[model samples]
Target chain A: GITFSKNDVEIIARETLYRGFFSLDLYRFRHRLFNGGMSGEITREIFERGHAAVLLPFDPVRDEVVLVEQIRIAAYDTSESPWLLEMVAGMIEAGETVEDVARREALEEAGLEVGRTKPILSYLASPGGTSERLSILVGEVDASTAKEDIRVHVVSREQAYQWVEEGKIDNAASVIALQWLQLHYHNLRNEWTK
Target chain B: QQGITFSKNDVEIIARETLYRGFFSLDLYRFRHRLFNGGMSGEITREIFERGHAAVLLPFDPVRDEVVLVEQIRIAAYDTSESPWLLEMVAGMIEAGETVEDVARREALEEAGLEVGRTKPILSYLASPGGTSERLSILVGEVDASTAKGEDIRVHVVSREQAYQWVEEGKIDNAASVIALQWLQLHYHNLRNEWTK
Candidate 1:
C-alpha cells in the first residue's frame, strides 16, 4: 500500500489530434516518481472512444448462455475468423445508466429481453491508450430469439468455458464474462431460480 | 463465415487513407472479402486505430505463490475511474531492437524491478477488436520475487489469490490485468505443473 494520488500528475497541455467517430487527444505532462523527482515532459496519444456496457444473457432454467456473432473489420488482421462471438455490447450514450445500456443492447443485438442483472465488473478495454472502459454484467433472459441481423447461440455453461479455452471467445468482454460465469454460475443459478 | 477459415489473405485492401498521424496513427481502409455465400462483397470502409503492440509479463513466484505488480496513473482513464491510477501487470509498448519476449522482460525489469525467468506464452487478445488493431501478447513468467519518469509507479507483492480477488472485485480494472489473472486462475494447475515440473 504505497502512496500516490490524482494530485501527482500534472497535465501541461492537451490538444485534439484527430476527430471522427472516435477522437484522439495528445497529452503533454509529468508526474512525480516513486524514487525521487518529477520526470521530464512526456507525450501520449489518448483515444477518446468513451465507455460501453456489455451484457451476457444467462437463462437459469435452461442453464445456457446466449452469445452472438458479428463481423468486426478491426479483427480481420489477426482473428482466425473476423466474425467474433461476443456479448451484446453498445456504447454508453450520454445520460444513460449502466443497467439501461445492458438491457437495451440485449434486445437490440440478441432480441432477448433482460429480466434482472448482476454486475460483474467495469474494466478498461485498453487503458494504456484508450479511455474505453466496459461495464460487464450477467442478466437473466428467456434465451430464444432471432434478429435478422444476427443469430444467437444458446449453449451450456460448460460449452462456453470450452470456447474460451479454445480462444474462440477471444474478445475482452465475452471472455471476462465467460470466465466469471464458469467460476460463479452455480451460485447464480441457485440465486436466480430460487 | 461460420465454419470456413476466412483469414487475412482472403481480404483485399482496395485503398488506405491516412486520417491522422500524431503520437498515434489512424487510417480508413476500403476492402472486400469473400462472403459466406461464395461471392465478393461490396467494398467496405472501416476506420482503424493503430498504436502498435504491447507485451505483458505476469510475474509469478511459484515457490511462494505470489505475484509482482506495478501501479501507475493512466490519463486515459481519467473520467471512468475515481482515481486513474491502476494496479496492473508489467507491460510496455514494443520498440525497435526488441522481440515481443524481450519487451516483456525489459518492462518487467523496468516497471517492477523484477527479473523474469522461464517464461511461457499464455495467449494474445485484441485490446478492443471493435475499433482498434492493437493487440497484446501475455506471458506468465517465473519471478524469484523481488521504476519512474513520466511513470510514477509503486511496486507491490501479493499472493496470486489476492491479486485474483482484486481482479474479481474490480480493484484490478485494467484489461490486460484482468485477462492475465483470469487466465492464471483458469489454467493454474497446468501452468504450475509445467513451471514446477
Candidate 2:
C-alpha cells in the first residue's frame, strides 16, 4: 500500500456502478499511488478493483476449525464496528493455482498447512471494482499440530484471540467456509477420508 | 464482436467509405447497429475483457428444513456500508471436465456438506455489467439437511444456538446467510424432507 502526501492534488471520487447492494466508488489522489510515486494525480479513483483471498481451515478429526483475526481497515472505512476477526487470506498472486495459493496462504495467514485443499466456493467478493473475485476453500488441517505463529496480544490488545473465541467470525470468506463446514463436515469427512 | 486478420489475399485490417472509417491492427473495436443503407453504419467499442463464466446453485435440504449456503468475505461488501462478507449460494466456474450440474453437485459437496439429490435451476444471469463478461447459473436442490455429519468438511457444525449467537454478534458473517435463511423460512415448511442413505 502506497502513502499519499497532503500536498497531493484535490482528491476526486467517482461512483461508476450503483448496484443495489453497494455502489462502486473511486477516489483519485496522486502522490505515489497511481503516478508511480510521481507528483501528479493521474486518472483514477479512490475505489479501484483488486484481488483478495479467504481460507477456512476445518480439522475433520478434531471436529474443530480455525480462522484468523487481523485488524481490517475496511471495517473502519465502511463504518462497521468490530474492526477485527478476519479470515486467513491474501491476494491471489499471479501465475499460481488457486490451490497452491491457498496452501501457501494458510501457512502465512493462519500458520497451518492446508493439506489436500478442496475448492469450496467462488464468487465476486466485491463487485465495485468488478475487479475483485474470491476463491474460498475449507482446507484439511491437523488441529493438534497447528499453533499461533506470533501472538499480537500487546498490539491487538487481545482483540484477535477474543474475536475467535467470543466474536463471531463475521468476515465473509471465513463465514462462508465455516457455514459450508457446518452443514457438510460429517459427510465430507466420511466421503473423503473413508 | 471484433477480429483482425492478416493475409496476402483480400484480408485487410482497416478500410473505410465516406461516412465511416476503420483503423488497421488497432487495439480497440466497435460495431454499429445496421442503418438504412445496407453498408456499415454507427459503431461502438465492444468493451470486452471479462470473458469468464460462473455457475450458482441454491442447494436445498428438505430433511433439515433448510437451504445450504456458502459464507465468505466478498470485497464487494467493502463497497457497501452493510457488510463485507456475504452469504451466497454454492458457486464455481464451469470447468472443462464437468457439466453445470456436475459443478454444482461437486461444489455443494465441497462447500456445503450435502450430496445434491435433485437440482432445479432457478435462473442464470450476468453477475456484473461494466467490465465483466462473467455470468452465473442459479439452482435449487433437494438434500438431507438433518444429517449434521458433514463428511466432506471438518469444521464444527453450528447448532441453532451457535448460529443465532454468530448472527447476532456478527460472527456468522456473510450476506447470503441472511438471504438464504429467509428463503428457507418461507419455503422449507412446505417442501419434502428426506434423509439420504
Largest TM-score belongs to which candidate? 1
Docking class of 2: incorrect
Write down the TM-score for model 2. 0.39
State the displacement of the C-alpha of residue B78, model 1, in Å, after optimal TM-score superposition: 1.5
DockQ score of each predicted structure, in the order shown: 0.53, 0.03
Ten contiguous residues with the weakest lDDT in model 1 chain A: A143-152
lDDT by residue for model 1 over A1-194, one digit each (tens)?
A: 33566687788998889889888889888877778678799888988887899998998888888888666778776677777677888989999998999898888888888888998888998888898999998999986653413446777877877887777777888888888888888899999999
Instruction: Tell me the TM-score of each prediction against the true structure.
Output: 0.91, 0.39
Tens-place lDDT per residue, model 2, B60-106, is 65544454444433333444224433445666777656677888787
lDDT of 2 by residue, A12-114 (tens): 4444432222223444433323324443543322123445556667666656566443322222212133123445666666676677777787787656877
Ignoring the other chain, what TM-score does chain B have in each prediction? Answer: 0.91, 0.58
